[PDB]
Amino acid sequence: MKRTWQPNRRKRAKTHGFRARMRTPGGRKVLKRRRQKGRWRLTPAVRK
Amino acid sequence: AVKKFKPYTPSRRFMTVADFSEITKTEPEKSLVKPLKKTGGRNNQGRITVRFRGGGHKRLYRIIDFKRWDKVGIPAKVAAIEYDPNRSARIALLHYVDGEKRYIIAPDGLQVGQQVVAGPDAPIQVGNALPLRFIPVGTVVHAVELEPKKGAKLARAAGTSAQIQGREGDYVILRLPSGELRKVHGECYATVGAVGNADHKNIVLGKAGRSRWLGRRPHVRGAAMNPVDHPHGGGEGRAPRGRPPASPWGWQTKGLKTRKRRKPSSRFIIARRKK
RNA sequence: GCGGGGUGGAGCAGCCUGGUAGCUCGUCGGGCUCAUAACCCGAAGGUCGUCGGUUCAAAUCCGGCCCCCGCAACCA
RNA sequence: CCGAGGGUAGGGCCCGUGACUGGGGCGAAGUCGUAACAAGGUAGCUGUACCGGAAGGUGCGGCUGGAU
RNA sequence: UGGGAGAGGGUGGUGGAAUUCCCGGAGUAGCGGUGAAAUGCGCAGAUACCGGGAGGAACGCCGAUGGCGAAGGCAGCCACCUGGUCCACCCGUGACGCUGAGGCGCGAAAGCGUGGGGAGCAAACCGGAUUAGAUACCCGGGUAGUCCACGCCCUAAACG
RNA sequence: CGAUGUCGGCUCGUCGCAUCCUGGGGCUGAAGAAGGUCCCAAGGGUUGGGCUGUUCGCCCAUUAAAGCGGCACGCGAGCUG
RNA sequence: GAAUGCCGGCAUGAGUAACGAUAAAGAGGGUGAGAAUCCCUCUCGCCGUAAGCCCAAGGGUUCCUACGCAAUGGUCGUCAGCGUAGGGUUAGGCGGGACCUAAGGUGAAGCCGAAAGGCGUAGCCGAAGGGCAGCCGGUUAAUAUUCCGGCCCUUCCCGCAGGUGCGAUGGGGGGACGCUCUAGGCUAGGGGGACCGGAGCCAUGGACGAGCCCGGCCAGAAGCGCAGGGUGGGAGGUAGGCAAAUCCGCCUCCCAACAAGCUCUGCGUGGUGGGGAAGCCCGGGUGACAACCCCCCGAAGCCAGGGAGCCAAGAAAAGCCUCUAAGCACAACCUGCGGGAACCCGUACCGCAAACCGACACAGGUGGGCGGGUGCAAGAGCACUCAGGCGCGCGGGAGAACCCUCGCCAAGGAACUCUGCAAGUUGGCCCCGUAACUUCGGGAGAAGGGGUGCUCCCUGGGGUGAUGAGCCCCGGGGAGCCGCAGUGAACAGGCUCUGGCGACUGUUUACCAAAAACACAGCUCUCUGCGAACUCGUAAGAGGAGGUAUAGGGAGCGACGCUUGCCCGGUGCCGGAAGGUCAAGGGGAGGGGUGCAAGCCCCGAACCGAAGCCCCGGUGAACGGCGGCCGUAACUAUAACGGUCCUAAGGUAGCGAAAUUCCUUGUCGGGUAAGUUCCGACCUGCACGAAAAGCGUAACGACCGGAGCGCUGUCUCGGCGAGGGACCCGGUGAAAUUGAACUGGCCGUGAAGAUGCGGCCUACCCGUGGCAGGACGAAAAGACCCCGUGGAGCUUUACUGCAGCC
RNA sequence: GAGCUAGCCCUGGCCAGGGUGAAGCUGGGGUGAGACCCAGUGGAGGCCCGAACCGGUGGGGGAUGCAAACCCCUCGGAUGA
Numbered sequence A: 001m002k003r004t005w006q007p008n009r010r011k012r013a014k015t016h017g018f019r020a021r022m023r024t025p026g027g028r029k030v031l032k033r034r035r036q037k038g039r040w041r042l043t044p045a046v047r048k
Numbered sequence B: 001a002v003k004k005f006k007p008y009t010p011s012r013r014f015m016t017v018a019d020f021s022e023i024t025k026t027e028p029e030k031s032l033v034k035p036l037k038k039t040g041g042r043n044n045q046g047r048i049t050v051r052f053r054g055g056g057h058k059r060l061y062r063i064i065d066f067k068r069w070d071k072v073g074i075p076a077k078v079a080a081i082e083y084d085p086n087r088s089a090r091i092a093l094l095h096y097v098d099g100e101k102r103y104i105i106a107p108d109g110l111q112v113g114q115q116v117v118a119g120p121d122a123p124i125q126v127g128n129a130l131p132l133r134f135i136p137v138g139t140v141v142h143a144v145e146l147e148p149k150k151g152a153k154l155a156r157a158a159g160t161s162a163q164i165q166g167r168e169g170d171y172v173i174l175r176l177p178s179g180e181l182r183k184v185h186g187e188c189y190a191t192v193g194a195v196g197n198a199d200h201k202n203i204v205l206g207k208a209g210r211s212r213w214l215g216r217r218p219h220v221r222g223a224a225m226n227p228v229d230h231p232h233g234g235g236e237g238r239a240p241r242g243r244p245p246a247s248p249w250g251w252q253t254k255g256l257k258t259r260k261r262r263k264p265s266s267r268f269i270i271a272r273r274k275k
Numbered sequence C: 001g002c003g004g005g006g007u008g009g010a011g012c013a014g015c016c017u018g019g020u021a022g023c024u025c026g027u028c029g030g031g032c033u034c035a036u037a038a039c040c041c042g043a044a045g046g047u048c049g050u051c052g053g054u055u056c057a058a059a060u061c062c063g064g065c066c067c068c069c070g071c072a073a074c075c076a
Numbered sequence D: 001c002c003g004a005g006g007g008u009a010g011g012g013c014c015c016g017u018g019a020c021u022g023g024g025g026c027g028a029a030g031u032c033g034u035a036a037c038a039a040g041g042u043a044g045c046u047g048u049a050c051c052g053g054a055a056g057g058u059g060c061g062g063c064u065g066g067a068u
Numbered sequence E: 001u002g003g004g005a006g007a008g009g010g011u012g013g014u015g016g017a018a019u020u021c022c023c024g025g026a027g028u029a030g031c032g033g034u035g036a037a038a039u040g041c042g043c044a045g046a047u048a049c050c051g052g053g054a055g056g057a058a059c060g061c062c063g064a065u066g067g068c069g070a071a072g073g074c075a076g077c078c079a080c081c082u083g084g085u086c087c088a089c090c091c092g093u094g095a096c097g098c099u100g101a102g103g104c105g106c107g108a109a110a111g112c113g114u115g116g117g118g119a120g121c122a123a124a125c126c127g128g129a130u131u132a133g134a135u136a137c138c139c140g141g142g143u144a145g146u147c148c149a150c151g152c153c154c155u156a157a158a159c160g
Numbered sequence F: 001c002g003a004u005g006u007c008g009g010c011u012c013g014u015c016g017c018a019u020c021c022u023g024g025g026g027c028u029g030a031a032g033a034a035g036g037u038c039c040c041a042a043g044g045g046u047u048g049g050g051c052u053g054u055u056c057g058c059c060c061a062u063u064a065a066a067g068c069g070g071c072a073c074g075c076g077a078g079c080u081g
Numbered sequence G: 001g002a003a004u005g006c007c008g009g010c011a012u013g014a015g016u017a018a019c020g021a022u023a024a025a026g027a028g029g030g031u032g033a034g035a036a037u038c039c040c041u042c043u044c045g046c047c048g049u050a051a052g053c054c055c056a057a058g059g060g061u062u063c064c065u066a067c068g069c070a071a072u073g074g075u076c077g078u079c080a081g082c083g084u085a086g087g088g089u090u091a092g093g094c095g096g097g098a099c100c101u102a103a104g105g106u107g108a109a110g111c112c113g114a115a116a117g118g119c120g121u122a123g124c125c126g127a128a129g130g131g132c133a134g135c136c137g138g139u140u141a142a143u144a145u146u147c148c149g150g151c152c153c154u155u156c157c158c159g160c161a162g163g164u165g166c167g168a169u170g171g172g173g174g175g176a177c178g179c180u181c182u183a184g185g186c187u188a189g190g191g192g193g194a195c196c197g198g199a200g201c202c203a204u205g206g207a208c209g210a211g212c213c214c215g216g217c218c219a220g221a222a223g224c225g226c227a228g229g230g231u232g233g234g235a236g237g238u239a240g241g242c243a244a245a246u247c248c249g250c251c252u253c254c255c256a257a258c259a260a261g262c263u264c265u266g267c268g269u270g271g272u273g274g275g276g277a278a279g280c281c282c283g284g285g286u287g288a289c290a291a292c293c294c295c296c297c298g299a300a301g302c303c304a305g306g307g308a309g310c311c312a313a314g315a316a317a318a319g320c321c322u323c324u325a326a327g328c329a330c331a332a333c334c335u336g337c338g339g340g341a342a343c344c345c346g347u348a349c350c351g352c353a354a355a356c357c358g359a360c361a362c363a364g365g366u367g368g369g370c371g372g373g374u375g376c377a378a379g380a381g382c383a384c385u386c387a388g389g390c391g392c393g394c395g396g397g398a399g400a401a402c403c404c405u406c407g408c409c410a411a412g413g414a415a416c417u418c419u420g421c422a423a424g425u426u427g428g429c430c431c432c433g434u435a436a437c438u439u440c441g442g443g444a445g446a447a448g449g450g451g452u453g454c455u456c457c458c459u460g461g462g463g464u465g466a467u468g469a470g471c472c473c474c475g476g477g478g479a480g481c482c483g484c485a486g487u488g489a490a491c492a493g494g495c496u497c498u499g500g501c502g503a504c505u506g507u508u509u510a511c512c513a514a515a516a517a518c519a520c521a522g523c524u525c526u527c528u529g530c531g532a533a534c535u536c537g538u539a540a541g542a543g544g545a546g547g548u549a550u551a552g553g554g555a556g557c558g559a560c561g562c563u564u565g566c567c568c569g570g571u572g573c574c575g576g577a578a579g580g581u582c583a584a585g586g587g588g589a590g591g592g593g594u595g596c597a598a599g600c601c602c603c604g605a606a607c608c609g610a611a612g613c614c615c616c617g618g619u620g621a622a623c624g625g626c627g628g629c630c631g632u633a634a635c636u637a638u639a640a641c642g643g644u645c646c647u648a649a650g651g652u653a654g655c656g657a658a659a660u661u662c663c664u665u666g667u668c669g670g671g672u673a674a675g676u677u678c679c680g681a682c683c684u685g686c687a688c689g690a691a692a693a694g695c696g697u698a699a700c701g702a703c704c705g706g707a708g709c710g711c712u713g714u715c716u717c718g719g720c721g722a723g724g725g726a727c728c729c730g731g732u733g734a735a736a737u738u739g740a741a742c743u744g745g746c747c748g749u750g751a752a753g754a755u756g757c758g759g760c761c762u763a764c765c766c767g768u769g770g771c772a773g774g775a776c777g778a779a780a781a782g783a784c785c786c787c788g789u790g791g792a793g794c795u796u797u798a799c800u801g802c803a804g805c806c
Numbered sequence H: 001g002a003g004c005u006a007g008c009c010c011u012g013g014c015c016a017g018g019g020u021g022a023a024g025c026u027g028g029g030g031u032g033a034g035a036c037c038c039a040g041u042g043g044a045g046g047c048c049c050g051a052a053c054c055g056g057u058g059g060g061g062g063a064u065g066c067a068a069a070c071c072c073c074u075c076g077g078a079u080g081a
């Protein structure tokens, strides 16, 4: 049947993307937390 | 002059539509239309703040002149009468001799190709606008400003009217469509005549689908819901209200008056509404 | 099982707060009417479901037996 | 080919009968009331509406076949 | 051809009396109602009186034993549209008439549908009386309805 | 109760005997026929339908007879539901 | 040594299930260490509104080629979407950007919020919408509207010529709009040709034929032709389009008005450039100087912004045109011609799938375009088949039970069972015919029937063409032929009668309920006078609504018909400027502390003092409620009638053993051989009843009952047959479970149901196919039940707070 | 976190074919004029049948599945809410 993951490069970038993260107080904490932890990528991969 | 249908389907059995006879122009004035932004009853928060709305036919908003003191002494001809999907009333096209074109709502009996005018010295003829203080006591009137220069607020719905009853100081006394007796300032404009398309209420939508076309989504009863949803929610089997009949938000809905008591306009309402 | 009742012939007060039984109707004698009803004047009739206890004294308070009305009898 | 008629299917009219039900006629001495005939004790009668154990009552309008 | 009387009919409009209600005044202890009462209303200021306002319905006197209409029916006043009818003159057509099964139309009240309207009145209904009872008559309330518009119903002691 | 799945049907039986039939008896208020009642006997047999989820029961048509009960009210790692 | 412990490792189950659609294979020849599995050929089967082709998303090198086979591939592998390496994606015209706006998002101004932040006109951003210039062919192993060839075209810059009041972010026009139905003319595409071109072919009894097989086009500027779209012209006035305006709007006058003209598109033609089959050869050559023509069918596509009708009344903005304004008129723009200039990103490949979403090369999911032919009434349905693409990545045998999916079945025909569940039957079309009832539409495909192929002959009408032929499309009549059978295959209703519920079409518990539930038109109550009420938000601000009582909110009821009775004492709501109660505050009789004292300080009665409550009314389509006992008629029985107690008032109409009736399978009637269900009645209604509506109701229903006909393997009662499995052999090889096991029956005993204890009986050791009685078999730390001063949802006149409101 | 799912907003797209035959329109009849009736024309509709598409009624299969909801037969809607 239709499953839950329906990839959409625009959807991915606009929802989890770097610029969406930077606009919001909670989003910046995410980047800060993912930097602090040392994540190789702060934001989902998507080719655009 | 509502049209009936033969019962060739279950829904045509009862469905009735307007006769549209008075309409003389089947596409609007391009200079006077702008897109009506559908809300679905959702506010700028994105939240449904008025329930059960959406999915109606696309509409263009026809800009209506609810001032008319805008153009004192400049007569206009009645070019046409048109359908307006944003009102119950029909609308009239006015070709002012100015060359300016404007829409007003069409009073009953207004005939196309007639002349109308506005101002303190306008004739008492259907279609004309005067400050209330210059309209003879006893005259049926529509599109009435509530306060001077603020815009026509009262009696705009199809077939409606307010009757002038008498005067007191700078104020006149109206009987509104509701039957309320209110003092309205004399400098307030109004148009002589009742709003047209009076057979509007005799329309029988006929089937669920017509409500849907009007943007009216299905209304669901409180009694049909669960306690989390509504005071009338739950019950094993059908259930009576089992408390005073209430809204989704708990306040009583059979008789509870809700006009704010200390409201400044109280000084101006003589008698609360009719039936 | 829980609650309430039983008293002139019929339907009900009095019990709670012990000493006192009452109301309407019916019944009986008289009256008015030609006569009957209605109406008017008088009168009789209970011995308080029953047995046992409490008390100086029990319709009345406590216990049992007998009926009557009501409510309950649910979970797998 | 037509053809008595047989068969299948569906209709129409009529007759008998049917738990039960509806009023009707009649029936020496039942029960309730007293609507009508006197102005019958609210003049009656009426079409209609509504109501009531029942006769009836009441509204609206009409009629005199109504007393005074 | 010329005239007349008329609540004949339809539409639009308009006048005053009264009732009810609202507002202001002035005012006090009852009003109201009946056979007698009670219910009801009234010191939270009723009734009675004055001024103001809103609304609906019906049109006093004229008014008659009258007039009009085919019947049902029609009554303030104004205007418009319209039917019938009588009279005079003896002018025109020249029996073109009568009646009328069917048909069609109209048809009081009540009733019904859809809107409106709603002062007074009032089935139902409630209450007070009366009474053995009183699902009545009498009293205090009161919903349809009575009113308007369109559409039905098509009945009658629709009677001379 | 860190689970022992439940009515009734179907399927498949097996067992008890306090025996419904069939076999053998005694008593009879047993003439015969046909019954009653008790004794012995579990080898075999013990039908098809209408109603109801029903077991049960009632009913129809038969039958030699239309037995009763146990097997986790036998049987859901066999079916049904 | 245990914690259903944790991490890992390895066992058991087991050579067991399985190896992923039953569309299907066989042989020959290659390659190679090795071949059912790779390559090639032939034969066979499958899809063919796809299982073919193109685009989009998503994926991201998976593409092509060489070389490889450890792992990946459910087997094998020499093969591969795998490993290694090299190569491959070329644009002014395709898509996106250097253009425009939509929702929304953002946000100079401004507003609001403890902070964070929220909001906000313009403006900006935002596309699959608007706008904008490329078509046909060839080429590569792999890209091509991109490279090449041919023929076209757009914008920018500069120049020359000619023309003109040039000039915009401003004004105006336009862009610019729905649904259904649809005309004319075309094109896409297709059918046929006794015509034109083609390598051939004559078989097996016949045919050398007006025979078979194959093919018969594509693109193209200007011009022209056909069909369409768009569009009046001139003048006078002008206060309106927030400056101006010759533009636009409005008024008047002339002319042209179904036109023409001007313009713009489509189609045809068009210099020209291409392409070009079978068959036979080796993707290529040949065919071939290929031919390239006539007739018919014909779009949902094009002309298009066409036309008509309807109501539910159908984006914006830029490009573009016009108007002017500062400005500037050595300028500037318009037209034409010329030269120059023209950037960034994508472009491989899969793309109904083995490359996307589903942990898998997963029978599932995934938007758009093309989708040929024949025949069946039509069609994207169905069967076959073209182009193309496949035989689904384990096979070979066997011919048991049993399972699945399938075919048939004597006599009977629902006897099956909760139930005709399932499966039969019926089945398209044409024609005849068709009931109760009804809201007059319907019910209706009612029911029921007859016809259906083929051949010859006669004939009626339409399209194209020409008015004829030809082709094509509707038909009519007569005579025949064959078979068991003519919608001969595939696709394709069983019907009726009668109840309950819901009017109806719709909606729903994604993944056990599709219903009688929800919704629904409609009915009523109620709130709301607009800065509305209500809703969201601390707020600002939004929604409501750019609406205005014929409107908007809330509530119940639920088309329609006929109706909806009595109770306001309690609760709710509405009304009441009296009275009673009432907090802070006002007041201050009067006391208290302290100080020598002026004073400072504290307490404090009467009394004025809001909403709320009390109190007085009203109010039911507001919450709700609508009696008991006893007696009475000239047979009996029963009570129209009476008595009395109680209540705020004692259930009206209608309906009733009902989706409600306990007793109950009530009783009676009907249907049946037999009827706890069904239908119709009765009425002592345990415990109907009137908008939590009462009683009906045509039509409707994958709803739930009852009956009948038809027909059946449902059954009596089973049989046979087919394929896929199961079985055997080669390959690969799980699982839950598992204290250990050397694990029999009975009767007993035992924590009360023992393979494991006692006694006795029986029993050589080990498997394979089968069946499920036991191992209180597996699975899930029982959902029932209880317990925990465990938890959560929900309710209220539980308690106590809080928002909100007063 | 609304790439599933629910509602709404904006912008696009899709719905083979067949059947029924409303109003209006025309003509005819009718009448004082009408209502109205008949034929033709017309092409309405939460109309009918039925693919795509959207569903998920009954039954069967599947049940360590092809699949953590699937497959076969059957059935519902298919111009509309």
Ligand SMILES: *C(=O)[C@H](CCSC)NC=O
Binding pocket: C076, G784
């Ligand atoms: C009792 O019947 C129970 C069923 C649970 S119903 C929630 N089962 C008991 O074993």
Ligand SMILES: [K+]
Binding pocket: none
């Ligand atoms: K329970």
Ligand SMILES: [Mg+2]
Binding pocket: A006, H003
């Ligand atoms: Mg998606």
Ligand SMILES: [Mg+2]
Binding pocket: A008, A009, A010, A011
């Ligand atoms: Mg995207």
Ligand SMILES: [Mg+2]
Binding pocket: A008, A010, A011
């Ligand atoms: Mg997105």
Ligand SMILES: [Mg+2]
Binding pocket: A013, A014, A015, A016, A017, A018, A019, A020, A021
């Ligand atoms: Mg982002």
Ligand SMILES: [Mg+2]
Binding pocket: none
């Ligand atoms: Mg990581």
Ligand SMILES: [Mg+2]
Binding pocket: A040
């Ligand atoms: Mg790094």
Ligand SMILES: [Mg+2]
Binding pocket: A016, A021, A030, A031, A034, A042, A043, A044
């Ligand atoms: Mg992140």
Ligand SMILES: [Mg+2]
Binding pocket: B030, B031
């Ligand atoms: Mg515009």
Ligand SMILES: [Mg+2]
Binding pocket: B044, B045
């Ligand atoms: Mg916003």
Ligand SMILES: [Mg+2]
Binding pocket: none
């Ligand atoms: Mg936001």
Ligand SMILES: [Mg+2]
Binding pocket: B049, B050, B051, G535
């Ligand atoms: Mg709301």
Ligand SMILES: [Mg+2]
Binding pocket: B056, B057, B058, B085, B213, B214, B215, G312
């Ligand atoms: Mg709408």
Ligand SMILES: [Mg+2]
Binding pocket: B219, B220, B221
């Ligand atoms: Mg609702």
Ligand SMILES: [Mg+2]
Binding pocket: B223, B224, B225, B226, B233, B234, B235
């Ligand atoms: Mg509910």
